[PDB]
Amino acid sequence: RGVTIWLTGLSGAGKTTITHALEKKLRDSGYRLEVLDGDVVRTNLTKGLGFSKEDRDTNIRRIGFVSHLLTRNGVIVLVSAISPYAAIRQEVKHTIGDFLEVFVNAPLAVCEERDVKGLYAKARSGEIKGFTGIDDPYEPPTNPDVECRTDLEELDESVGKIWQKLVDLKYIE
Amino acid sequence: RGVTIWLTGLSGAGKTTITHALEKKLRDSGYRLEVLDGDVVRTNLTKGLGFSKEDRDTNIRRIGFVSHLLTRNGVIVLVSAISPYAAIRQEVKHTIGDFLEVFVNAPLAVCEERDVKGLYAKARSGEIKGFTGIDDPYEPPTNPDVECRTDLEELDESVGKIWQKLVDLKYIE
Ligand SMILES: Nc1ncnc2c1ncn2[C@@H]1O[C@H](COP(=O)(O)OP(=O)(O)NP(=O)(O)O)[C@@H](O)[C@H]1O
Ligand SMILES: Nc1ncnc2c1ncn2[C@@H]1O[C@H](COP(=O)(O)OP(=O)(O)NP(=O)(O)O)[C@@H](O)[C@H]1O
Ligand SMILES: Nc1ncnc2c1ncn2[C@@H]1O[C@H](COP(=O)(O)OS(=O)(=O)O)[C@@H](O)[C@H]1O
Ligand SMILES: Nc1ncnc2c1ncn2[C@@H]1O[C@H](COP(=O)(O)OS(=O)(=O)O)[C@@H](O)[C@H]1O
Ligand SMILES: C[As](C)(=O)[O-]
Ligand SMILES: [Mg+2]
Ligand SMILES: [Mg+2]
Numbered sequence: 001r002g003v004t005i006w007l008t009g010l011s012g013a014g015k016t017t018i019t020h021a022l023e024k025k026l027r028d029s030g031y032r033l034e035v036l037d038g039d040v041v042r043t044n045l046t047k048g049l050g051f052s053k054e055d056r057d058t059n060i061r062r063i064g065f066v067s068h069l070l071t072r073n074g075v076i077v078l079v080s081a082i083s084p085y086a087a088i089r090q091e092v093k094h095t096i097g098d099f100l101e102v103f104v105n106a107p108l109a110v111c112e113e114r115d116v117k118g119l120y121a122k123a124r125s126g127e128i129k130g131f132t133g134i135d136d137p138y139e140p141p142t143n144p145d146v147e148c149r150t151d152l153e154e155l156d157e158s159v160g161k162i163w164q165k166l167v168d169l170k171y172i173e
Numbered sequence: 174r175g176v177t178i179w180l181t182g183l184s185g186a187g188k189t190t191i192t193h194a195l196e197k198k199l200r201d202s203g204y205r206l207e208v209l210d211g212d213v214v215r216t217n218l219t220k221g222l223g224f225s226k227e228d229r230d231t232n233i234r235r236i237g238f239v240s241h242l243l244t245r246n247g248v249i250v251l252v253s254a255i256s257p258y259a260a261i262r263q264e265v266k267h268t269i270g271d272f273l274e275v276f277v278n279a280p281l282a283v284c285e286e287r288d289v290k291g292l293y294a295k296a297r298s299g300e301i302k303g304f305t306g307i308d309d310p311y312e313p314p315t316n317p318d319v320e321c322r323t324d325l326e327e328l329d330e331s332v333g334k335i336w337q338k339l340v341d342l343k344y345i346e
């Protein structure tokens with residue numbers, strides 16, 4: 001029953017939006033789950049970390065650590081974090097086993113015109129350095145379990161895709 | 174039936190030892206559980222932290238964060254950490270709710286006598302500053318749920334106390 005559903009993508013691509021929707025849908029149906037949103041655990045579990053390659057690796061690995069413990073005790077874990085490095089993602093997947101990579105995919109141009117929290121403009125001004133997709137890498141999942149193209153898709157479809165994978169893999173009724 | 178069993182006491186008091194014995198006994202009975210030892214989490218989950226007041230509060234709270242997720246998902250969590258500051262212990266207690274505070278009470282002289290890791294000698298020489306009970310506080314529990322005087326007990330008696338408080342409080346049959 002326990003699985004980690006791992007949502008990676010550009011900032012503003014739609015990880016959190018999906019995670020809240022998926023979260024609600026799973027809980028209504030009575031499934032047990034926990035959520036680890038990158039923005040939020042950075043105020044908690046990963047307080048004090050920044051955005052260097054070393055610090056993102058600490059962040060993601062720490063998250064992987066707590067996901068691993070929940071998943072192996074039968075909990076659906078909803079993770080949403082940029083996870084820009086593919087090798088780190090692959091590492092965490094190997095560690096948890098029961099792992100669905102979800103590529104929340106919006107082209108950068110969309111993510112930027114969206115500018116949900118004003119961050120992208122700050123990244124272009126030079127105000128913020130090393131912003132992912134602007135002057136810091138993002139390594140797209142080459143073979144993800146689900147891909148949600150959120151320029152193209154509506155929220156219900158994007159959630160539907162993930163929900164459907166869970167059914168196919170027999171993680172839920 | 175999920176619960177956090179929280180062992181606090183001086184270095185050398187006997188938490189880690191009580192934890193393995195309580196672990197194997199619970200695990201043999203078929204209960205599902207997770208161990209979070211202060212020594213061990215400080216090589217992954219709280220790597221980077223020291224023993225300033227600041228850093229210990231960070232350590233305990235983070236341990237607490239992880240226990241709380243596991244506890245409200247039905248898991249039995251065995252924590253053994255010094256947890257020197259009382260107000261912080263109480264905080265984690267109210268946050269998790271299903272919480273056993275186990276005071277592993279050995280006097281400092283007994284603990285120094287065993288010096289399992291050779292650490293007290295190092296605290297006295299000054300090689301290690303701010304060692305609990307030599308150069309930093311230890312605020313004993315005032316009204317702990319269970320107290321183990323490991324000076325006046327054997328394992329099975331100490332482990333045995335906890336195990337039965339667990340069945341009184343109905344966490345395990
Ligand atoms: N499937 C979707 N289709 C269309 N628009 C979407 C979809 N999912 C999310 N959005 C919208 O696009 C934006 C994505 O927001 P958000 O979930 O905060 O992205 P994000 O990846 O979580 N950014 P961040 O959490 O800070 O790294 C919001 O304005 C949503 O309304
Ligand atoms: N009730 C007891 N009576 C006598 N010796 C004991 C008792 N319980 C444990 N010990 C011994 O205590 C020694 C080590 O204690 P230990 O469990 O490591 O304390 P600790 O403070 O929890 N270590 P740590 O987790 O690093 O802070 C071992 O040699 C045990 O055999
Ligand atoms: N330099 C930055 N790059 C990306 N996101 C940043 C940056 N600075 C602040 N943020 C914020 O931090 C969030 C990303 O945090 P994470 O998902 O936890 O990143 S990750 O790379 O370590 O996985 C973004 O949503 C964004 O709001
Ligand atoms: N200054 C120190 N005080 C106490 N323990 C220390 C100190 N330095 C190293 N240690 C080691 O770290 C262990 C304590 O770690 P914790 O249980 O995680 O401490 S706590 O205060 O933050 O709860 C001890 O068992 C001991 O081996
Ligand atoms: C040994 As000291 C730095 O507490 O005076
Ligand atoms: Mg977000
Ligand atoms: Mg120990």
Ligand code: NA
Binds near residue numbers: 150152154
């Ligand atoms: Na859309």
